[PDB]
Design a protein around this ligand. Structure first.
Ligand SMILES: [K+]
Ligand SMILES: [K+]
Ligand SMILES: [K+]
Ligand SMILES: [K+]
Ligand SMILES: [K+]
Ligand SMILES: [K+]
Ligand SMILES: [K+]
Ligand SMILES: [K+]
Ligand SMILES: [K+]
Ligand SMILES: [K+]
Ligand SMILES: [K+]
Ligand SMILES: [K+]
Ligand SMILES: [K+]
Ligand SMILES: [K+]
Ligand SMILES: [K+]
Ligand SMILES: [K+]
Ligand SMILES: [K+]
Ligand SMILES: [Mg+2]
Ligand SMILES: [Mg+2]
Ligand SMILES: [Mg+2]
Ligand SMILES: [Mg+2]
Ligand SMILES: [Mg+2]
Ligand SMILES: [Mg+2]
Ligand SMILES: [Mg+2]
Ligand SMILES: [Mg+2]
Ligand SMILES: [Mg+2]
Ligand SMILES: [Mg+2]
Ligand SMILES: [Mg+2]
Ligand SMILES: [Mg+2]
Ligand SMILES: [Mg+2]
Ligand SMILES: [Mg+2]
Ligand SMILES: [Mg+2]
Ligand SMILES: [Mg+2]
Ligand SMILES: [Mg+2]
Ligand SMILES: [Mg+2]
Ligand SMILES: [Mg+2]
Ligand SMILES: [Mg+2]
Ligand SMILES: [Mg+2]
Ligand SMILES: [Mg+2]
Ligand SMILES: [Mg+2]
Ligand SMILES: [Mg+2]
Ligand SMILES: [Mg+2]
Ligand SMILES: [Mg+2]
Ligand SMILES: [Mg+2]
Ligand SMILES: [Mg+2]
Ligand SMILES: [Mg+2]
Ligand SMILES: [Mg+2]
Ligand SMILES: [Mg+2]
Ligand SMILES: [Mg+2]
Ligand code: NA
Ligand code: NA
Ligand code: NA
Ligand code: NA
Ligand code: NA
Ligand code: NA
Ligand code: NA
Ligand code: NA
Ligand code: NA
Ligand code: NA
Ligand code: NA
Ligand code: NA
Ligand code: NA
Ligand code: NA
Lengths: 211, 255, 96, 203
RNA sequence: AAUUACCGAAUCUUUGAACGCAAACGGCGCAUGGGAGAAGCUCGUGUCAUCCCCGUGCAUGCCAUAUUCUCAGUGUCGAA
RNA sequence: CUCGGAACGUUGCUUCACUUAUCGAAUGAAGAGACCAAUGGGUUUAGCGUAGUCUUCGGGCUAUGCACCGUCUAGGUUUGGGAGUCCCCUGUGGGUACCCAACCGUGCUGUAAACUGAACCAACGGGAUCAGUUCCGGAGUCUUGUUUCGAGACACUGCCAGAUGGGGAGUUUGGCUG
RNA sequence: GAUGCAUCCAAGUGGUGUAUAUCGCAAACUGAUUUCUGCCCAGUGCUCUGGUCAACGUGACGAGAUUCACCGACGCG
RNA sequence: CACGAGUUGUUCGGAAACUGAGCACAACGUUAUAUCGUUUUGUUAGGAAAGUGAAGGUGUGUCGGCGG
RNA sequence: CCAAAGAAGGUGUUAGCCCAUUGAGCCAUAAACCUGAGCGCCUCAUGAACAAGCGAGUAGCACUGUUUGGGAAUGCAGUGUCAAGUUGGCAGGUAUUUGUCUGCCAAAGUUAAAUACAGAGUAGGAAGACCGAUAGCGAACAAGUAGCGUGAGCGA
RNA sequence: AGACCUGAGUGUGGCAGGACUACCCGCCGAACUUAAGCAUAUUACUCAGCGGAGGAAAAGAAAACAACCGUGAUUCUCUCAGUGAGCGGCGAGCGAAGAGGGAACGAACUCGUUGCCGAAUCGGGUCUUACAAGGCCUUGAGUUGUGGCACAAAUAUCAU
């Protein structure tokens, strides 16, 4: 089918062409172990379900009706910041301790600027493998980005280790990231053809050297 | 003025080909894995005539390389092809008349027909009756074979393009005088609506640039430019020379 | 069903068979060929005419021959079974 | 917010990264149909600016129009009359390609109401516009005060009457005062005012 | 149970955007309900093969939708 | 005035190599390439070093090794190893003449003067649970991916410019006057 | 010699000769044998080898518009 | 001219129900504009247009066969 | 003799009183309409007091075409090129470069009335210094009829 | 296995299609004619052609005029004005706008943005006499953002 052919040829073209650093930075994702650890933390601090929020608000209403003088806070339990607008606000206000950005968002321009904003505001950020995996962590179908703003004392050590391992890959390698171009990757058949051609012309010019 | 007949013929209409009673396109068999690596053996079942063509056609029966069935290709027969003959098509086919071989496997100086201009083209050169190409040389650096075409031109083609061995049947059709407008009528009946031919000087100025005058003459030179618009490009188109050729015919065509 | 009008199955044959014919040829066929001539629905079937004769006049039609007249009506020649008298059925219908 | 970043990123259309994205997208679009239904807009910021909401009843279609000037469809380029009206190739359509794309979408899908459209891509031969359409039979649309108006009959095929933004652009309604005095409310209306012969009763 | 006038309720053949498919054809379907059946069976009584009849649905595109229907992809992951 | 160079960034052309845009073919997009191994790829196939050079101290980045991805073959030719003619009647029937490595080879069971036979819906063998019941190979495997082939960043697409262009369009082709 | 020649068409992955393949397609002229077809390339065509001719570029004066120089293809010579 | 009649089919002709020169619905492109193009050289459409089923699973009815 | 009625239609000649008409009124009503945003009830809403941003292949600009009274270009279209926003932009009807002033804030959207009905409809009205059967509509009448043309059409 | 991205099939619920077309909105678009010829011009941004609405349509809430002592969305009328505007083989011809007197007018609102929120949103079930602008439930859609509050006619909103 035409859609199958086009989805394969699109990947072929993206590998063959010269990819500027701003787009190539999404190819160099966080490693598998730290990605799993970050997803574990995000799933632990996932937002509450519709039912859970509704029950919490019902309980708040009952605590209000018990006596109007006592004021009960309606704030939700501590969770991750989810959504492009909310995550952008957290980064801009420098409230986020660690940001996670999916690498397969299309249109890419939704999050193409996010690593640079995180670098400018000096917030640790990681680029991970799937918005689908982020959505599974947060209870939705997909998620462009997720921001951890605070954790509990039990998870503070995990957050610090995650921040260090993430900074190893992304924030401390800013000079390399800003300059590394991607693409220009040959096909397997082209690489084999080049190798065989070099082998054929290995020693043709041996008689032109004086030694 | 009115539209010229040479431009009216481009609309199709009643000037198309009389394809009824024709057996179909005459092509070599497809360039499959068997042709590219080994060979296929087929049996010539029948030799037939197609209306509008001066050469004989051969119905050659092959087995399907992937299915339990038979294929029955229809090709232009080289001269000498007979019913019951075995035709071998592929890389490992022997050099015999009627066999289809890649042009790189055919010796220099060989006479071939049904030559492919491109690999897989299924044959487009040297297909008129009595016509053939001559293999001049091979170039293994670039992988190309040089041929002398029926017109006398030289053409370089990829060495993977196939070619049949021999000349096309029905050769010598043009040496018999027709002698009769009726014979010409029956000849063109199976080809198309192109006969009889009225001279441009015999028409009126409205339809043709050559028409008109109290004497039957072309007022202006009959050699026209290559950039002339349609309706004006009638006569001798972009002629490099005119008159009776003396001292040797040149090879016609672009360089 | 998007069609909600009440349609009765017991009155269908009154539409199939309209009225008999009393012309010279029609009455000539009654006595000798056991044949009754009727004007029937123009969109009717020979099988439906055979069934309508059974439902209306309680007779068996061994053959029906239909023709559309030059004036647009449809005329059926219905030959009754030999067990039935076409003259008796014509008398019951009301033509003689 | 994120809108500012997307807006500046799409204002930087000649940069290396945006040229790469647009080249890949133009190839992908070139290998598709003339009209293509999309789940989500390619430019959500522009779509939301022009009226799109991520609600039920809103649709986005990418429409392709060939580029270049108009050719007068006269037989063999032969025109009869004054030499003034003799050009066959140098004439230009008095309607823009965005309006043409909107009209093609609206004429193809007559059960939808065309709201707006925006430029997404163009190459040497094609030009792509994303057209926002609304379903007038959707309860979400029919009960929303902000898109309710499009359910009315005066808005049927507004893109064919030139009431969309591109239609207003090529009608000249982008200008007011001395710049559009003969074009308001329309050039036909101004012509009627200026050319009708008025016969007062007592004169 | 006059007849006029007016209208809220009903009927409304064959077509036609005409839309199951055709068409100088009162043609021919496929589902899904009915009907009539003088062969056969059953005990004129049922029931009824072939046949014949009738109602309803069935164009194409789009949009929404699926108690969250069934799938495709050397698309991206993720198991294994 | 002219001429000579760097050693830089940039670039106007341009050779040559390439392939992904594009173009030309063919095909029922029916067998491409590799395995024969880089001037290859992986920190979701980058593991182990080394030397610089950085670092947000978590790690990189440049070179440069080594390892992995990643392998199987018809046939040809020669190197090692083991290892099983018989019936009936001279005839007949049935059977055996292996394996391994290397190198070449390169996907390879058929012909080479042709003169009209047939071939489908597997036999069979392994592994688990005679025959089931499943797997597996028979019938190699792999994929930085492209249906294949030929071209290939030119000629293919717009727009702007100039020539040419009765092929066609519009118009005109004074007056006085024995 | 086919990514061809002629040519349709407002346009397109559009159309005809072409289900073709130089013993073929397309465009002219003369008009069966037979016997022949002289001389002329100046003109006008057609055709094939090394000053001027557009846009675009490139630089410069000037506050800039403007300007100027340079480059510039068929074609024509 | 008026009035009243007249055309009877299992097998006749057509249709159901073949292909031809052809046409052009879909599809796809094009067009300000579909009321345009393509649509048989085996044959639509960059094109997922097969609703049909060879075996064998399993039940059901009609056989033969085996033993009991 | 009537007139709060003289109104102009009918009826065998020219009718206020022959007839119908010519007026207050009366009666009956799906919904909608209108009426302390008519008025209850239930439900559901709801009023008053107790720092940064603002619409980008857009606006320009060049070339070409077109349109305009718009003229060193009034709008628009094609293609090229393409902003500003920290002398921010746009307009101020002679092109340029300045620097002052004024008005305004483009590139999403909705909106009633006053306006058209220059060969439309639906349900009604009022008519006329109009035409009067070769006129006025083609058609005062079984007129887009009869008839005519292969047809588009034509048409008494 | 599975996801979600892209794309199919089917069920279910809808809608488009034609007519009309006087007026109105978008395109496309002549020529006869006039210039005592004719090519620019004129006819005419007209006829014919192709789309699309409605009882009207379109326009419409200032990137507006102006240069005032200023005015204040649109539309229409008289006037400006056949113009000591302009345009034009400056020929034939063509040709507006501001101001002023009026008609109309409860005339204004909505989104994106930016701040602050963040599913409070939307469909679908079910219930309330209710396909409630209500309750309850619902992954169904939506976090690639639905909804709220405040932006000059403004100066908080949010409780109780
Ligand atoms: K002829
Ligand atoms: K175009
Ligand atoms: K012309
Ligand atoms: K005005
Ligand atoms: K897959
Ligand atoms: K290729
Ligand atoms: K002779
Ligand atoms: K000459
Ligand atoms: K030259
Ligand atoms: K009277
Ligand atoms: K200012
Ligand atoms: K409006
Ligand atoms: K009007
Ligand atoms: K009216
Ligand atoms: K005159
Ligand atoms: K005009
Ligand atoms: K006023
Ligand atoms: Mg003549
Ligand atoms: Mg001529
Ligand atoms: Mg002559
Ligand atoms: Mg002559
Ligand atoms: Mg009959
Ligand atoms: Mg135009
Ligand atoms: Mg206006
Ligand atoms: Mg039908
Ligand atoms: Mg390390
Ligand atoms: Mg490293
Ligand atoms: Mg490195
Ligand atoms: Mg002669
Ligand atoms: Mg001579
Ligand atoms: Mg008669
Ligand atoms: Mg018959
Ligand atoms: Mg045919
Ligand atoms: Mg064809
Ligand atoms: Mg009240
Ligand atoms: Mg009240
Ligand atoms: Mg622009
Ligand atoms: Mg003009
Ligand atoms: Mg003008
Ligand atoms: Mg603005
Ligand atoms: Mg009056
Ligand atoms: Mg008369
Ligand atoms: Mg009359
Ligand atoms: Mg008359
Ligand atoms: Mg018109
Ligand atoms: Mg009104
Ligand atoms: Mg309106
Ligand atoms: Mg004018
Ligand atoms: Mg919003
Ligand atoms: Na043909
Ligand atoms: Na002549
Ligand atoms: Na292929
Ligand atoms: Na000419
Ligand atoms: Na002429
Ligand atoms: Na003339
Ligand atoms: Na000659
Ligand atoms: Na002659
Ligand atoms: Na001749
Ligand atoms: Na000469
Ligand atoms: Na020069
Ligand atoms: Na009165
Ligand atoms: Na319509
Ligand atoms: Na006024």
């Amino acid at each position: 089918p035409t859609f199958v052919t086009m989805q394969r040829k699109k990947r072929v073209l993206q590998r063959r062409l010269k990819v500027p650093p701003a787009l190539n930075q999404f190819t160099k994702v966080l490693d598998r172990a730290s990605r799993n650890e970050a997803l574990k933390l995000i799933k632990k601090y996932a937002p509450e379900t519709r039912k859970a929020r509704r029950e919490r608000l019902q309980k708040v209403a009952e605590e209000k009706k018990k006596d109007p003088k006592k004021t009960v806070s309606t704030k939700a339990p501590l969770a991750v910041v989810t959504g492009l607008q909310e995550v952008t606000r957290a980064i801009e206000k420098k409230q986020a301790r660690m940001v996670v950005i999916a690498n397969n968002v299309d249109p890419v321009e939704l999050v193409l600027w996010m690593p640079n904003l995180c670098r400018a505001n000096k917030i640790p950020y990681a680029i991970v493998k799937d918005m689908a995996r982020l959505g599974d962590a947060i209870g939705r179908k997909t998620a462009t980005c997720v921001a951890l703003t605070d954790v509990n004392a039990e998870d503070e050590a995990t957050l610090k280790n995650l921040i260090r391992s993430v900074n190893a890959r992304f924030l401390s390698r800013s000079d390399v990231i800003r300059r590394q171009w991607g693409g220009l990757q040959l096909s397997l058949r082209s690489r084999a053809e080049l190798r065989k051609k070099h082998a054929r012309n290995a020693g043709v010019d041996a008689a032109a050297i004086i030694q | 003025g009115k539209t010229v007949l040479s431009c009216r013929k481009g609309n199709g209409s009643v000037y198309q080909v009389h394809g009824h009673k024709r057996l179909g396109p005459a092509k070599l068999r497809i360039l499959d894995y068997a042709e590219r690596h080994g060979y296929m053996r087929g049996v010539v079942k029948s030799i037939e005539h197609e209306a509008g063509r001066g050469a004989a056609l051969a119905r050659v029966e092959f087995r399907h390389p992937y299915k339990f069935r038979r294929v029955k290709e229809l090709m232009v027969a080289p001269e000498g092809m007979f019913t019951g003959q075995s035709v071998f098509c592929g890389q490992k086919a022997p050099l015999a008349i009627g066999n289809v071989l890649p042009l790189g496997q055919i010796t220099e100086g060989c006479i071939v027909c049904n030559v492919e201009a491109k690999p897989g083209d299924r044959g487009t050169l040297a297909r008129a009756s009595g016509d053939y190409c001559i293999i001049i040389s091979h170039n293994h650096e670039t992988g190309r074979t040089r041929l002398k075409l029926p017109s006398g031109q030289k053409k370089s083609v990829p060495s993977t393009s196939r070619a049949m061995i021999g000349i096309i049947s029905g050769g010598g059709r043009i040496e018999k005088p027709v002698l009769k407008a009726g014979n010409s009528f029956y000849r063109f009946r199976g080809k198309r609506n192109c006969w009889p031919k009225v001279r441009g000087v015999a028409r009126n100025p409205v339809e043709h640039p050559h028409g008109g005058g109290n004497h039957q003459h072309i007022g202006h030179p009959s050699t026209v430019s290559r950039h002339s618009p349609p309706g004006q490009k009638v006569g001798l188109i972009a002629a490099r020379r005119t008159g009776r050729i003396r001292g040797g015919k040149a090879v016609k065509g672009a360089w | 069903s998007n069609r909600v009008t009440v349609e009765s199955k017991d009155i269908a044959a009154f539409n199939v068979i309209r009225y008999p014919l009393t012309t010279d040829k029609a009455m000539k066929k009654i006595e000798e060929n056991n044949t009754l001539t009727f004007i029937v629905d123009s969109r009717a079937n020979k099988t439906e005419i055979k069934k309508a004769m059974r439902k209306l006049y309680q007779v068996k039609a061994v053959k029906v021959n239909t023709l559309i007249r030059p004036d647009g009506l449809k005329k059926a020649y219905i030959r009754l079974s030999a067990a039935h008298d076409a003259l008796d059925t014509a008398n019951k219908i009301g033509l003689v | 917010g994120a809108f500012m970043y997307l807006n500046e990123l799409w204002k930087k259309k000649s940069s290396d990264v945006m040229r790469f994205i647009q080249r890949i997208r133009s190839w992908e679009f070139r290998h598709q149909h003339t009209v293509v239904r999309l789940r989500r807009p390619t430019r959500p910021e522009k779509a939301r600016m022009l009226g799109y909401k991520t609600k039920q009843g809103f649709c986005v279609f990418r429409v392709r129009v060939r580029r270049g000037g108009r050719k007068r469809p006269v037989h063999k380029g032969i025109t009869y009359g004054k030499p003034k009206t003799s050009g066959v190739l140098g004439m230009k359509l008095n309607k823009n390609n965005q309006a043409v794309a909107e009209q093609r979408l609206g004429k193809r899908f007559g059960n939808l109401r065309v709201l707006n459209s925006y430029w997404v891509n163009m190459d040497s031969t094609f030009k792509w516009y994303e057209v926002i359409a609304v379903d007038p039979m959707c309860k979400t649309i029919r009960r929303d005060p902000r898109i309710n108006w499009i359910v009315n009959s005066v808005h049927k095929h507004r893109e064919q009457r030139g009431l969309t933004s591109a239609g207003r652009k090529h009608r000249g309604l982008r200008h007011k005062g001395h710049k559009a005095s003969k074009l308001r409310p329309s050039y036909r209306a101004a012509w009627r005012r200026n050319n009708r012969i008025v016969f007062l009763r007592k004169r």
